[PDB]
Amino acid sequence: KLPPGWEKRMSRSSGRVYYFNHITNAAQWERPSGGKNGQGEPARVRCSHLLVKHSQSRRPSSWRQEKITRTKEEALELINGYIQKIKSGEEDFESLASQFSDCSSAKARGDLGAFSRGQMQKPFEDASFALRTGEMSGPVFTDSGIHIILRTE
């Protein structure tokens, strides 16, 4: 049961029960699904993203700053902060990506356009295709850094 990647979990040293997606790293309180079968995954999707680079990114530099020195742990801290702000409603995905994404797609408010499998780095690809329209991922690690992905189509 539950859509691809989803599983009911419980927080450790805490007792909060929630739903987690092992492919997208998404987490939420709501059950992800309420019969359709043999649906597979979309052959093409459109996604926007917000990238946070770190010292170990293949290109430790971005339009936002010449030299990226933050550690991977610091980047994850930032990513989690952006997710928290989006989930509270204090900020929107587009505004944050336009201002803080280390990817040049920031100029397009994070929009990457449409793509098929075999086009993006595997972790990014797996997460994008496991997202349903309008859903946002949790932290996704690639060689570029850490991403937050939003499927728009």
Short mmCIF file of all heavy atoms in Angstrom, two decimals, residues 59-94:
data_model
loop_
_atom_site.label_atom_id
_atom_site.label_comp_id
_atom_site.label_asym_id
_atom_site.label_seq_id
_atom_site.Cartn_x
_atom_site.Cartn_y
_atom_site.Cartn_z
N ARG A 59 31.73 21.88 -8.19
CA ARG A 59 32.09 23.25 -8.52
C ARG A 59 31.74 24.12 -7.31
O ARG A 59 30.66 24.70 -7.25
CB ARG A 59 31.33 23.72 -9.76
CG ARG A 59 31.48 25.19 -10.10
CD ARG A 59 30.62 25.56 -11.30
NE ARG A 59 30.27 26.98 -11.31
CZ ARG A 59 29.48 27.55 -12.22
NH1 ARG A 59 28.95 26.82 -13.20
NH2 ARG A 59 29.20 28.84 -12.14
N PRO A 60 32.65 24.19 -6.32
CA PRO A 60 32.44 24.98 -5.10
C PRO A 60 32.39 26.49 -5.32
O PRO A 60 33.14 27.25 -4.72
CB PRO A 60 33.61 24.56 -4.21
CG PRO A 60 34.69 24.28 -5.21
CD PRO A 60 33.96 23.52 -6.29
N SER A 61 31.48 26.90 -6.20
CA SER A 61 31.29 28.30 -6.54
C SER A 61 29.94 28.45 -7.22
O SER A 61 29.45 27.52 -7.86
CB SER A 61 32.40 28.75 -7.50
OG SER A 61 32.22 30.09 -7.90
N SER A 62 29.34 29.63 -7.09
CA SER A 62 28.05 29.90 -7.71
C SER A 62 27.90 31.38 -7.96
O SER A 62 28.73 32.18 -7.53
CB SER A 62 26.91 29.43 -6.80
OG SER A 62 26.78 30.28 -5.67
N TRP A 63 26.82 31.74 -8.65
CA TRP A 63 26.55 33.14 -8.95
C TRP A 63 26.34 33.92 -7.65
O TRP A 63 26.50 35.15 -7.62
CB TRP A 63 25.30 33.24 -9.83
CG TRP A 63 24.05 32.80 -9.13
CD1 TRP A 63 23.57 31.53 -9.01
CD2 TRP A 63 23.14 33.64 -8.40
NE1 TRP A 63 22.42 31.52 -8.25
CE2 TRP A 63 22.14 32.81 -7.86
CE3 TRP A 63 23.08 35.02 -8.15
CZ2 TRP A 63 21.08 33.31 -7.09
CZ3 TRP A 63 22.04 35.52 -7.38
CH2 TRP A 63 21.05 34.66 -6.86
N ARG A 64 26.00 33.21 -6.57
CA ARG A 64 25.75 33.80 -5.25
C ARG A 64 27.02 34.14 -4.48
O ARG A 64 27.02 35.06 -3.65
CB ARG A 64 24.92 32.87 -4.36
CG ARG A 64 23.50 32.66 -4.79
CD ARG A 64 22.68 32.10 -3.63
NE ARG A 64 22.51 33.09 -2.57
CZ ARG A 64 23.06 33.01 -1.36
NH1 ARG A 64 23.83 31.98 -1.04
NH2 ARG A 64 22.84 33.96 -0.46
N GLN A 65 28.08 33.37 -4.70
CA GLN A 65 29.35 33.61 -4.03
C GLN A 65 30.49 32.85 -4.70
O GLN A 65 30.37 31.65 -4.99
CB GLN A 65 29.27 33.25 -2.54
CG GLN A 65 28.99 31.79 -2.23
CD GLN A 65 29.15 31.48 -0.75
OE1 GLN A 65 28.87 30.37 -0.30
NE2 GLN A 65 29.62 32.46 0.01
N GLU A 66 31.58 33.56 -4.94
CA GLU A 66 32.76 33.00 -5.61
C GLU A 66 33.32 31.74 -4.97
O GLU A 66 33.64 30.78 -5.66
CB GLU A 66 33.88 34.04 -5.69
CG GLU A 66 35.06 33.56 -6.53
CD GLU A 66 36.32 34.38 -6.34
OE1 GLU A 66 36.34 35.25 -5.44
OE2 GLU A 66 37.30 34.16 -7.09
N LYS A 67 33.47 31.75 -3.65
CA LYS A 67 34.02 30.59 -2.97
C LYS A 67 33.09 30.04 -1.90
O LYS A 67 32.83 30.69 -0.89
CB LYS A 67 35.37 30.95 -2.33
CG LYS A 67 36.29 29.75 -2.13
CD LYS A 67 36.60 29.08 -3.47
CE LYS A 67 37.26 30.05 -4.44
NZ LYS A 67 37.34 29.51 -5.82
N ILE A 68 32.59 28.83 -2.14
CA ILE A 68 31.69 28.17 -1.21
C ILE A 68 32.53 27.34 -0.24
O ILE A 68 33.14 26.34 -0.63
CB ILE A 68 30.68 27.29 -1.96
CG1 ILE A 68 29.83 28.18 -2.87
CG2 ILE A 68 29.81 26.52 -0.98
CD1 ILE A 68 28.82 27.45 -3.71
N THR A 69 32.56 27.76 1.02
CA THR A 69 33.35 27.08 2.04
C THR A 69 32.55 26.32 3.09
O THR A 69 33.13 25.58 3.88
CB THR A 69 34.27 28.08 2.76
OG1 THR A 69 33.47 29.06 3.44
CG2 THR A 69 35.18 28.79 1.76
N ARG A 70 31.23 26.49 3.10
CA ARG A 70 30.40 25.79 4.08
C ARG A 70 30.57 24.28 3.92
O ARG A 70 30.79 23.79 2.81
CB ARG A 70 28.93 26.18 3.91
CG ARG A 70 28.27 25.68 2.64
CD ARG A 70 26.77 25.99 2.64
NE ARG A 70 26.46 27.41 2.47
CZ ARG A 70 26.22 28.00 1.30
NH1 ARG A 70 26.25 27.29 0.18
NH2 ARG A 70 25.94 29.29 1.25
N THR A 71 30.48 23.55 5.02
CA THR A 71 30.62 22.10 5.00
C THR A 71 29.30 21.47 4.55
O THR A 71 28.29 22.17 4.45
CB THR A 71 30.96 21.55 6.39
OG1 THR A 71 29.89 21.86 7.29
CG2 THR A 71 32.25 22.17 6.92
N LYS A 72 29.32 20.17 4.29
CA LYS A 72 28.10 19.47 3.87
C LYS A 72 27.07 19.54 4.98
O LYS A 72 25.87 19.64 4.72
CB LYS A 72 28.39 18.00 3.55
CG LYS A 72 29.09 17.76 2.23
CD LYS A 72 29.25 16.26 1.94
CE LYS A 72 27.90 15.55 1.76
NZ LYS A 72 27.11 15.44 3.02
N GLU A 73 27.53 19.49 6.23
CA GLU A 73 26.64 19.54 7.37
C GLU A 73 25.96 20.91 7.47
O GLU A 73 24.78 21.00 7.79
CB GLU A 73 27.40 19.25 8.67
CG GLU A 73 28.24 17.98 8.62
CD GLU A 73 29.66 18.23 8.13
OE1 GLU A 73 30.45 18.84 8.88
OE2 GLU A 73 29.98 17.82 6.99
N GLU A 74 26.72 21.97 7.18
CA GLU A 74 26.18 23.32 7.23
C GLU A 74 25.16 23.52 6.11
O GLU A 74 24.17 24.23 6.27
CB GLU A 74 27.31 24.35 7.13
CG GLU A 74 28.27 24.30 8.34
CD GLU A 74 29.40 25.31 8.24
OE1 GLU A 74 30.10 25.33 7.20
OE2 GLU A 74 29.60 26.08 9.20
N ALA A 75 25.42 22.89 4.96
CA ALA A 75 24.51 22.99 3.82
C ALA A 75 23.20 22.29 4.15
O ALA A 75 22.13 22.76 3.77
CB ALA A 75 25.14 22.36 2.59
N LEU A 76 23.29 21.15 4.84
CA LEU A 76 22.09 20.41 5.21
C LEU A 76 21.28 21.22 6.21
O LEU A 76 20.05 21.20 6.17
CB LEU A 76 22.47 19.05 5.83
CG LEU A 76 21.32 18.14 6.26
CD1 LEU A 76 20.38 17.88 5.08
CD2 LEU A 76 21.88 16.83 6.78
N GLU A 77 21.97 21.93 7.10
CA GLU A 77 21.33 22.77 8.09
C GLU A 77 20.54 23.86 7.36
O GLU A 77 19.39 24.15 7.70
CB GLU A 77 22.39 23.40 9.02
CG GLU A 77 22.36 24.92 9.10
CD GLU A 77 23.74 25.53 9.31
OE1 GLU A 77 24.40 25.22 10.32
OE2 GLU A 77 24.16 26.34 8.45
N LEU A 78 21.16 24.46 6.35
CA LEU A 78 20.50 25.50 5.57
C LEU A 78 19.29 24.93 4.82
O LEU A 78 18.21 25.52 4.84
CB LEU A 78 21.49 26.13 4.58
CG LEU A 78 22.60 26.97 5.22
CD1 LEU A 78 23.63 27.37 4.16
CD2 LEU A 78 21.98 28.20 5.87
N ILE A 79 19.48 23.78 4.17
CA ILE A 79 18.40 23.13 3.43
C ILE A 79 17.20 22.88 4.35
O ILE A 79 16.06 23.19 3.99
CB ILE A 79 18.87 21.77 2.84
CG1 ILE A 79 19.70 22.01 1.57
CG2 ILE A 79 17.66 20.88 2.52
CD1 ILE A 79 18.88 22.49 0.37
N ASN A 80 17.46 22.32 5.53
CA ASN A 80 16.37 22.04 6.46
C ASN A 80 15.68 23.32 6.89
O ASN A 80 14.48 23.33 7.16
CB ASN A 80 16.89 21.27 7.68
CG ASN A 80 17.23 19.83 7.35
OD1 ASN A 80 16.67 19.25 6.42
ND2 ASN A 80 18.12 19.24 8.13
N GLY A 81 16.45 24.41 6.96
CA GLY A 81 15.88 25.69 7.33
C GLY A 81 14.94 26.19 6.25
O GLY A 81 13.85 26.69 6.54
N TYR A 82 15.35 26.05 4.99
CA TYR A 82 14.50 26.49 3.89
C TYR A 82 13.22 25.66 3.86
O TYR A 82 12.14 26.20 3.61
CB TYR A 82 15.23 26.38 2.53
CG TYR A 82 16.41 27.31 2.38
CD1 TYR A 82 17.66 26.83 1.97
CD2 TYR A 82 16.29 28.68 2.62
CE1 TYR A 82 18.75 27.69 1.81
CE2 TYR A 82 17.37 29.55 2.47
CZ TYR A 82 18.59 29.05 2.06
OH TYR A 82 19.66 29.91 1.92
N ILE A 83 13.34 24.36 4.11
CA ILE A 83 12.16 23.49 4.12
C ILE A 83 11.20 23.92 5.22
O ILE A 83 9.99 23.99 5.00
CB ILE A 83 12.55 22.00 4.35
CG1 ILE A 83 13.37 21.50 3.15
CG2 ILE A 83 11.29 21.14 4.50
CD1 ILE A 83 13.89 20.09 3.31
N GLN A 84 11.74 24.22 6.40
CA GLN A 84 10.92 24.66 7.52
C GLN A 84 10.17 25.96 7.19
O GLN A 84 8.98 26.09 7.50
CB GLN A 84 11.80 24.87 8.76
CG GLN A 84 11.10 25.52 9.96
CD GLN A 84 11.26 27.03 9.98
OE1 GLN A 84 12.38 27.55 10.03
NE2 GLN A 84 10.14 27.75 9.94
N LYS A 85 10.85 26.90 6.55
CA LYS A 85 10.22 28.16 6.20
C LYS A 85 9.11 27.97 5.17
O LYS A 85 8.07 28.63 5.23
CB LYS A 85 11.26 29.17 5.70
CG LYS A 85 10.71 30.58 5.55
CD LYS A 85 11.79 31.65 5.66
CE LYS A 85 12.28 31.81 7.09
NZ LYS A 85 13.28 32.91 7.22
N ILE A 86 9.32 27.04 4.24
CA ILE A 86 8.32 26.75 3.22
C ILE A 86 7.11 26.07 3.86
O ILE A 86 5.96 26.39 3.55
CB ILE A 86 8.91 25.83 2.12
CG1 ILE A 86 9.94 26.60 1.29
CG2 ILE A 86 7.82 25.31 1.20
CD1 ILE A 86 10.77 25.71 0.38
N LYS A 87 7.36 25.14 4.77
CA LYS A 87 6.26 24.43 5.41
C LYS A 87 5.45 25.27 6.38
O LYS A 87 4.28 24.98 6.64
CB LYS A 87 6.78 23.18 6.10
CG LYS A 87 7.28 22.13 5.12
CD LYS A 87 7.34 20.76 5.76
CE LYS A 87 7.77 19.69 4.77
NZ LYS A 87 7.68 18.32 5.36
N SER A 88 6.05 26.32 6.92
CA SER A 88 5.34 27.19 7.85
C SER A 88 4.47 28.17 7.06
O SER A 88 3.48 28.69 7.57
CB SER A 88 6.32 28.00 8.70
OG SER A 88 7.01 28.94 7.90
N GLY A 89 4.84 28.40 5.80
CA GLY A 89 4.12 29.33 4.97
C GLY A 89 4.75 30.72 5.01
O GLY A 89 4.26 31.65 4.36
N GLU A 90 5.83 30.87 5.77
CA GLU A 90 6.50 32.17 5.88
C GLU A 90 7.18 32.58 4.58
O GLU A 90 7.33 33.77 4.28
CB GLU A 90 7.52 32.16 7.03
CG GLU A 90 7.13 33.05 8.20
CD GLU A 90 8.30 33.41 9.11
OE1 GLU A 90 8.89 32.50 9.72
OE2 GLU A 90 8.62 34.62 9.22
N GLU A 91 7.60 31.59 3.79
CA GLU A 91 8.25 31.84 2.52
C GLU A 91 7.76 30.87 1.45
O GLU A 91 7.28 29.79 1.77
CB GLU A 91 9.77 31.72 2.67
CG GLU A 91 10.44 33.01 3.09
CD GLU A 91 10.64 33.96 1.92
OE1 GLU A 91 9.71 34.10 1.11
OE2 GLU A 91 11.73 34.57 1.82
N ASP A 92 7.88 31.26 0.19
CA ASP A 92 7.45 30.38 -0.89
C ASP A 92 8.67 29.81 -1.60
O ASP A 92 9.74 30.42 -1.61
CB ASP A 92 6.54 31.12 -1.88
CG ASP A 92 7.22 32.30 -2.53
OD1 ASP A 92 7.37 33.35 -1.87
OD2 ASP A 92 7.61 32.18 -3.71
N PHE A 93 8.51 28.64 -2.20
CA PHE A 93 9.61 27.97 -2.90
C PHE A 93 10.28 28.85 -3.95
O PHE A 93 11.51 28.96 -3.98
CB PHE A 93 9.10 26.68 -3.53
CG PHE A 93 10.19 25.77 -4.02
CD1 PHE A 93 10.58 24.68 -3.26
CD2 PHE A 93 10.83 26.02 -5.23
CE1 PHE A 93 11.61 23.84 -3.70
CE2 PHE A 93 11.86 25.19 -5.67
CZ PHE A 93 12.25 24.10 -4.90
N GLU A 94 9.49 29.49 -4.80
CA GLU A 94 10.04 30.35 -5.85
C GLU A 94 10.87 31.52 -5.36
O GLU A 94 11.97 31.76 -5.87
CB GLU A 94 8.91 30.87 -6.75
CG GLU A 94 8.30 29.83 -7.68
CD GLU A 94 7.71 28.65 -6.95
OE1 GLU A 94 6.91 28.86 -6.00
OE2 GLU A 94 8.02 27.50 -7.32
#
